[PDB]
């Protein structure tokens, strides 16, 4: 959660500036940041753990839509809150299969 915003040029600050380029104004709520961090820590724990890199993977999966439609949304302002994140980050990565090899 802190890596997401505190550091100079954090991921949240980068995407804010990237979208601002297309004339879009975005803002992450405290709750939103918290879910992005939970999801990241969650998949590093259930699958392969890549550390803080996972944040990049998740943000990209989250900023997927806006990054594409930003040019068509000039002048607007987007609010990335809890709901926006729960929708964007679908549900539980992908299975957990492994019993295929067990007797």
């Amino acid at each position: 959660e802190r890596i997401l915003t505190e550091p100079h040029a954090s991921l949240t600050e980068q995407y804010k500036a990237l979208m601002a380029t297309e004339g879009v104004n975005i803002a992450f709520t405290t709750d939103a940041v918290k879910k992005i961090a939970e999801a990241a820590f969650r998949v590093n724990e259930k699958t392969e753990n890549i550390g803080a890199r996972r944040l990049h993977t998740v943000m990209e999966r989250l900023m997927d839509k806006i990054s594409f439609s930003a040019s068509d949304m000039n002048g607007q302002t987007v609010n990335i809150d809890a709901a926006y994140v729960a929708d964007a980050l679908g549900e539980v990565v992908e299975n957990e299969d492994l019993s295929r090899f067990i007797l």
Partner: protein
């Protein structure tokens, strides 16, 4: 050697005897055949060739380390090393591994197997003796998983000549 594990009431236990025998003669009666792995958060008990057992154990530990210590995944990857062309030499030993989630038995030939329902595993020459006493104890008693293990091991020990009464019981709070 006898090793048995019972899981009930959110408690997991794995215990075993201490007799080490060379042929028909005993060498040591105080061996610890059950030990804790991965920051002491996973129980493991072994049976078979003294050297083969330790190497099966060790090989498994390296696995837990290369993963987030996930019992299942680890067991599957270790077993995969036998399911290839490079005929990874087989080990004449077996392991019982458990933690807060699952319980498995892994063999030096390359396969992983899960319990059945009553969450009971047992390996070694005296295995099936402790196994029966335990199934019985579980389907007709309210005894703790820790009590069932000690009681079944003792029983097994009074039947198998290669199983003594010097137990080592580990449980995962």
């Amino acid at each position: 050697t006898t090793i048995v594990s019972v899981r009930r009431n959110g408690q997991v236990v794995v215990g075993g005897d201490g007799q080490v025998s060379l042929g028909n003669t005993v060498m040591k009666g105080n061996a610890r055949k059950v030990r804790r792995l991965y920051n002491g958060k996973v129980l493991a008990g072994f049976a078979g060739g003294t050297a083969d057992a330790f190497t099966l154990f060790e090989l498994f530990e390296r696995k837990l380390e290369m993963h987030q210590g996930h019992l299942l995944k680890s067991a599957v990857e270790l077993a995969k090393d036998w399911r290839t062309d490079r005929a990874l030499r087989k080990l004449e030993a077996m392991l019982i591994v458990a933690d807060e989630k699952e319980s498995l038995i892994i063999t030096g030939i390359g396969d992983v197997v899960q319990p059945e329902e009553d969450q009971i595993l047992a390996i070694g020459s005296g295995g099936n003796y402790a196994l029966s006493a335990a199934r019985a104890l579980v389907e007709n008693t309210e005894l703790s998983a820790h009590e069932i293990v000690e009681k079944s091991l003792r029983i097994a020990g009074d039947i198998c000549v290669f199983t003594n009464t010097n137990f080592t019981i580990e449980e995962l709070p």
